[PDB]
Enzyme design. Structure first.
Site, PDB file in Angstrom:
ATOM      1  N   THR A  69       0.717  -1.297  -0.235  1.00  8.07           N
ATOM      2  CA  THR A  69       0.008  -0.041  -0.130  1.00  8.07           C
ATOM      3  C   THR A  69       0.914   1.271   0.013  1.00  8.07           C
ATOM      4  O   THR A  69       0.559   1.962  -0.836  1.00  8.07           O
ATOM      5  CB  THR A  69      -0.981   0.010   1.384  1.00  8.07           C
ATOM      6  OG1 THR A  69      -2.123  -0.896   0.821  1.00  8.07           O
ATOM      7  CG2 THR A  69      -1.557   1.264   1.050  1.00  8.07           C
ATOM      8  N   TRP A 111       0.098 -10.018   3.473  1.00  7.66           N
ATOM      9  CA  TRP A 111      -0.356  -9.409   2.235  1.00  7.66           C
ATOM     10  C   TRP A 111       0.038  -9.978   1.061  1.00  7.66           C
ATOM     11  O   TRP A 111      -0.615 -10.447   0.292  1.00  7.66           O
ATOM     12  CB  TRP A 111      -0.138  -7.804   2.353  1.00  7.66           C
ATOM     13  CG  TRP A 111      -0.912  -7.187   3.137  1.00  7.66           C
ATOM     14  CD1 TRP A 111      -1.646  -5.847   2.527  1.00  7.66           C
ATOM     15  CD2 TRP A 111      -1.014  -6.865   4.533  1.00  7.66           C
ATOM     16  NE1 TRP A 111      -2.225  -5.027   3.408  1.00  7.66           N
ATOM     17  CE2 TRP A 111      -2.074  -5.734   4.739  1.00  7.66           C
ATOM     18  CE3 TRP A 111      -0.762  -7.456   5.356  1.00  7.66           C
ATOM     19  CZ2 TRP A 111      -2.336  -5.435   6.013  1.00  7.66           C
ATOM     20  CZ3 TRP A 111      -1.152  -7.078   6.754  1.00  7.66           C
ATOM     21  CH2 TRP A 111      -1.832  -5.997   7.122  1.00  7.66           C
ATOM     22  N   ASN A 157      -4.550 -11.016   3.775  1.00  7.90           N
ATOM     23  CA  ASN A 157      -5.088  -9.810   3.847  1.00  7.90           C
ATOM     24  C   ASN A 157      -6.189  -9.435   2.651  1.00  7.90           C
ATOM     25  O   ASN A 157      -5.535  -9.402   1.720  1.00  7.90           O
ATOM     26  CB  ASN A 157      -4.128  -8.973   4.048  1.00  7.90           C
ATOM     27  CG  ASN A 157      -4.777  -7.386   4.436  1.00  7.90           C
ATOM     28  OD1 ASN A 157      -5.307  -7.407   5.476  1.00  7.90           O
ATOM     29  ND2 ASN A 157      -4.892  -6.587   3.556  1.00  7.90           N
ATOM     30  N   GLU A 158      -7.500  -9.414   3.071  1.00  4.70           N
ATOM     31  CA  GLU A 158      -8.463  -9.007   2.183  1.00  4.70           C
ATOM     32  C   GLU A 158      -8.274  -9.789   0.674  1.00  4.70           C
ATOM     33  O   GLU A 158      -8.498  -9.338  -0.269  1.00  4.70           O
ATOM     34  CB  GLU A 158      -8.226  -7.544   1.775  1.00  4.70           C
ATOM     35  CG  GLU A 158      -8.522  -6.699   2.963  1.00  4.70           C
ATOM     36  CD  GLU A 158      -8.380  -5.300   2.835  1.00  4.70           C
ATOM     37  OE1 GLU A 158      -8.058  -4.556   1.789  1.00  4.70           O
ATOM     38  OE2 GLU A 158      -8.602  -4.424   3.790  1.00  4.70           O
ATOM     39  N   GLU A 234      -9.533  -4.822  11.106  1.00  5.83           N
ATOM     40  CA  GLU A 234      -8.730  -3.443  10.525  1.00  5.83           C
ATOM     41  C   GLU A 234      -9.940  -2.608  10.259  1.00  5.83           C
ATOM     42  O   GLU A 234     -10.902  -2.759   9.587  1.00  5.83           O
ATOM     43  CB  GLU A 234      -8.427  -3.900   9.077  1.00  5.83           C
ATOM     44  CG  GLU A 234      -6.992  -2.965   8.942  1.00  5.83           C
ATOM     45  CD  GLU A 234      -6.512  -2.845   7.222  1.00  5.83           C
ATOM     46  OE1 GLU A 234      -5.973  -4.131   6.966  1.00  5.83           O
ATOM     47  OE2 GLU A 234      -6.758  -2.084   6.506  1.00  5.83           O
ATOM     48  N   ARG A 356     -14.470   4.723   4.884  1.00 13.43           N
ATOM     49  CA  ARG A 356     -15.094   3.275   4.696  1.00 13.43           C
ATOM     50  C   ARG A 356     -15.838   2.827   5.869  1.00 13.43           C
ATOM     51  O   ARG A 356     -15.178   2.147   6.650  1.00 13.43           O
ATOM     52  CB  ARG A 356     -13.943   2.325   4.062  1.00 13.43           C
ATOM     53  CG  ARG A 356     -14.401   1.149   3.349  1.00 13.43           C
ATOM     54  CD  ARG A 356     -13.393   0.116   2.792  1.00 13.43           C
ATOM     55  NE  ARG A 356     -12.423   1.013   2.168  1.00 13.43           N
ATOM     56  CZ  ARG A 356     -10.886   1.378   2.606  1.00 13.43           C
ATOM     57  NH1 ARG A 356     -10.571   0.688   3.795  1.00 13.43           N
ATOM     58  NH2 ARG A 356     -10.321   1.984   1.696  1.00 13.43           N
TER      59      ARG A 356
HETATM   60  O1  LIG Z   1      -5.261  -3.728   4.362  1.00 12.04           O
HETATM   61  C1  LIG Z   1      -5.476  -2.758   4.020  1.00 12.04           C
HETATM   62  N1  LIG Z   1      -6.607  -2.338   3.596  1.00 12.04           N
HETATM   63  C2  LIG Z   1      -7.123  -0.828   3.433  1.00 12.04           C
HETATM   64  C3  LIG Z   1      -6.116   0.169   3.656  1.00 12.04           C
HETATM   65  C4  LIG Z   1      -6.378   1.401   3.384  1.00 12.04           C
HETATM   66  O2  LIG Z   1      -7.750   1.754   3.439  1.00 12.04           O
HETATM   67  C5  LIG Z   1      -4.743  -0.171   3.235  1.00 12.04           C
HETATM   68  O3  LIG Z   1      -4.784  -0.465   2.125  1.00 12.04           O
HETATM   69  C6  LIG Z   1      -4.422  -1.627   4.190  1.00 12.04           C
HETATM   70  O4  LIG Z   1      -3.376  -2.289   3.575  1.00 12.04           O
END
Ligand SMILES: O=C1NC[C@H](CO)[C@H](O)[C@@H]1O
Ligand SMILES: *[C@@H]1O[C@H](CO)[C@@H](O[C@@H]2O[C@H](CO)[C@@H](O)[C@H](O)[C@H]2NC(C)=O)[C@H](O)[C@H]1NC(C)=O
Ligand SMILES: *[C@@H]1O[C@H](CO)[C@@H](O[C@@H]2O[C@H](CO)[C@@H](O)[C@H](O)[C@H]2NC(C)=O)[C@H](O)[C@H]1NC(C)=O
Ligand SMILES: *[C@@H]1O[C@H](CO)[C@@H](O[C@@H]2O[C@H](CO)[C@@H](O)[C@H](O)[C@H]2NC(C)=O)[C@H](O)[C@H]1NC(C)=O
Ligand SMILES: *[C@@H]1O[C@H](CO)[C@@H](O)[C@H](O)[C@H]1NC(C)=O
Ligand SMILES: [Ca+2]
Length: 640
Positions: A69, A111, A157-158, A234, A356
């Site tokens: 990021t 990540w 992650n995500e 998060e 968000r």
């Molecule tokens: O995991 C994440 N999620 C969103 C964040 C930004 O709002 C950032 O990219 C972070 O690394």
């Protein structure tokens, strides 16, 4: 009107702690080279108990060499058969946190992953055992080299989880004597992890916590049904002005109230990355100037304190929590030892918007709140009072409130954008160090010869890698270039973001517009290898592929190019040059107004080449692909 706080009918859910994220990606990059005492002061404001944010939880990225990021973070295994547990700064950070708070809770989460794990594909679930082996190495390394016990491990992650991977990870942890480590999943949305847990008993047994991202204070029915601890694993990610502090204040309360979430973790811990990178200044505090020592203890630090200084993991929420009649909310917790903490927030819509999600308007107006202590709380007749007003007074201790009445009751006058903490605890403290030096731009004259034999960190200061990974490198077999900086990735990672096709590290002042950059470069790959230096680099992080500027490339096939973009689609100039592999060259790039020039070994290669103007950005170095290359004697002179 009146709000009953009682425990005679029982308690709510166990409180698990407030924390923050270092990583995703390189969010703590610029903290490591702060001079003393400032660096230690910053860490105190974050982790020292009864002082500042006093965080209960520290979560860190498990570096995978990909862009995640605001930069890349180095992995403990760049290659197959490579293991190194001293790269990057998360080891150091966790150790600094644990020094100040021995009881801090530690979490790790990937990540990205090194490319070799994919075995030919950009996918970490090709070989489940291999990927789990990689992750478990990291946890063992934490213990064996840094005396760190990792409390929680996440998945990806995500990104999609794989049920079989989670099961293999559990089996692998247990096999390596890490039964104590708990698994949190899946660091994305409530689904599909929640319904997956209801349908698969075996999966349910191995997942300890459901962690969701940016849930907007709500959860879903399947998650409630699971019986698992639910965390906002998060959240936040908002500029740490008063509006960010408002957002943090509101969700800290209402994640539990509306969503049964017993932990909230902010991205990110501290804004120690160039502000012009994505989501600039979105940490609990700010520390983005190691050259000056200047840092800012932003409002979210004190918003944190209103909860963290007066709660610990293992306390319980009361059943009696909720919203206020005219807007805002309240929570209450006890430790089962007679202590009680009450946290009240009245954040207005216009001053607490998170990025968000964005909330539809809600009204907040002045009101009176009566609280009555029932059950085992009635016996309390003294409460310490802490207060904050946003928009401003921070974490100010007010006069003690007495309930000698015997009524077990009291009343407060509430306005907008306020926080109250009422607690039996007497240990509260607004920690204070003297003010740090004033803010100063990045030095307009700057140099690094990388001559450090036993560096404290694996990379030279201020260089923020945005694709690829750059490290201190010692070469005994060369006297002139014994100590250089080396790009060490030889293949594209299993990416999280869209990493560039070329590696690149940026440095300096994004405001720079006229500049001269010089560096010694060394191409390790014959025929096909290539390197560059650049200026006016305008974008990085998650957007690193979008970077424009002026890029001076040389190639091992005897050629050069000048491009407007990192991708090399747009040409300013190009030609032939006496350049081969495995030889040191000195590159100079001068940029001034509408015009640029380049030198090779002090001799003009091209000049008066027209470039876009106005324009501004960082200086940078890099390589054509994921290939070995070295850099030495870096210098930059710039007018901001
Ligand atoms: O995991 C994440 N999620 C969103 C964040 C930004 O709002 C950032 O990219 C972070 O690394
Ligand atoms: C988690 O969610 C809610 C809190 O938002 C709780 O559900 C009920 O909340 C209402 C008021 O909002 C209370 O009157 C009810 O008593 C609550 N339900 C019960 C069973 O007590 C819910 O209890 C919390 N826990 C779970 C497991 O959902
Ligand atoms: C509130 O919390 C404090 C701190 O945990 C409690 O004080 C501790 O009590 C235990 C035994 O219950 C002792 O072993 C510790 O040494 C005490 N520490 C301190 C700093 O006093 C306290 O009992 C709790 N209850 C109240 C009403 O204050
Ligand atoms: C960067 O260099 C450009 C070009 O030399 C500067 O722009 C010139 O500034 C002078 C005096 O300020 C003017 O007389 C010229 O007309 C400008 N030329 C152009 C093309 O704009 C610019 O000011 C410099 N910027 C910094 C921050 O030093
Ligand atoms: C908020 O509530 C107060 C009192 O009910 C009212 O006077 C005010 O107009 C309301 N504001 C909005 C935007 O609804
Ligand atoms: Ca050197």
């Amino acid at each position: 009107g009146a709000y009953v706080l009682d425990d005679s009918d029982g308690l709510g859910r166990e409180f698990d702690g407030i924390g923050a994220v270092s990583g995703g990606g390189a969010t703590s990059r610029l903290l490591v080279n702060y001079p003393e005492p400032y660096r230690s002061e910053i860490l105190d404001y974050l982790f020292k108990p009864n002082f500042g944010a006093s965080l209960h939880i520290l979560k860190v990225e498990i570096g995978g060499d990909g862009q995640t990021t605001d930069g890349t973070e180095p992995s403990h295994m760049h290659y197959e058969l490579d293991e190194n547990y001293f790269r990057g700064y998360e080891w150091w950070l966790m150790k600094e946190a644990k020094k100040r708070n021995p009881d801090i809770i530690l979490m790790g989460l990937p990540w990205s992953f090194p490319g070799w794990l994919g075995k030919g594909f950009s996918w970490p679930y090709v070989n489940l055992q291999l990927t789990a082996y990689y992750v478990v190495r990291w946890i063992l390394g934490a213990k064996h080299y840094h005396d760190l016990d990792i409390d929680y491990i996440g998945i990806w992650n995500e990104r999609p989880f794989d049920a079989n991977y989670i099961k293999e990870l559990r089996k692998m942890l247990d096999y390596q004597g890490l039964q104590r480590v708990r698994i949190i999943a899946s660091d994305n949305l409530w689904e599909p992890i929640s319904s997956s847990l209801l349908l698969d008993q075996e999966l349910w047994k191995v997942v300890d916590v459901i962690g969701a991202h940016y849930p907007g204070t709500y959860t879903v029915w399947n998650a409630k049904m699971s019986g698992k601890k639910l965390w906002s694993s998060e959240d936040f990610s908002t500029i740490n002005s008063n509006v960010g502090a408002g957002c943090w204040s509101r969700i800290l309360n209402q994640n539990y109230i509306n969503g049964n979430m017993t932990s909230t973790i902010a991205w990110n811990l501290v804004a120690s990355y160039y502000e012009e990178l994505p989501y600039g200044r979105s940490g609990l505090m700010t520390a983005q100037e190691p050259w000056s020592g200047h840092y800012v203890v932003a409002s979210p630090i004190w918003v944190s304190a209103h909860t963290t200084q007066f709660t610990q993991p293992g306390w319980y929420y009361l059943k009696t929590v909720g919203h206020l009649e005219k807007g805002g909310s309240y929570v209450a917790l006890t430790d089962g030892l007679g202590n009680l903490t009450i946290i009240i927030e009245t954040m207005s819509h216009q001053h607490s918007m998170c990025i968000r999600p964005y909330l539809p308007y809600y009204n907040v107006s002045h009101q009176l709140a009566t609280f009555t202590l029932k059950g085992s709380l009635r016996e309390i007749q003294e409460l310490q009072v802490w207060y904050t007003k946003l928009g401003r007074l921070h974490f100010k201790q007010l006069d003690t409130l007495w309930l000698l009445d015997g009524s077990g009751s009291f009343t407060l006058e509430l306005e907008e954008d306020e926080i109250f903490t009422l607690t039996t605890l007497t240990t509260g403290r607004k920690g204070s160090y003297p003010p740090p030096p004033s803010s100063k731009p990045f030095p307009t004259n700057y140099k690094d010869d990388f001559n450090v034999e036993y560096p404290l960190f694996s990379e030279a200061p201020n260089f923020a890698d945005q694709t690829g990974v750059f490290e201190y490198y010692m070469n005994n077999e060369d006297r002139e270039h014994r100590f250089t900086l080396r790009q060490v990735l030889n293949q594209r990672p299993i990416t999280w973001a869209a990493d560039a096709s070329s590696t690149i590290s940026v440095i300096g002042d994004h405001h720079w517009t006229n500049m001269t950059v010089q560096c010694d470069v060394y191409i390790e790959t014959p025929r096909s290898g290539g390197v560059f230096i650049a200026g006016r680099v305008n974008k990085g992080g998650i957007l690193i592929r979008s970077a424009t500027g002026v890029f001076f490339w040389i190639f091992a096939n005897g050629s050069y190019r000048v491009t407007a973009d990192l991708g090399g689609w747009i040409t300013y100039a190009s030609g032939h040059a006496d350049v081969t592999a495995k030889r040191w060259y000195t590159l100079t790039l001068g940029i001034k107004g509408y015009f640029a020039f380049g030198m090779l070994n002090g001799t003009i290669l091209w000049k008066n080449v027209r470039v876009k103007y106005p324009g501004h950005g960082w200086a940078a170095i890099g390589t054509h692909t994921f290939e070995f290359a070295q850099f030495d004697n870096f210098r930059v002179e710039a007018a901001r």
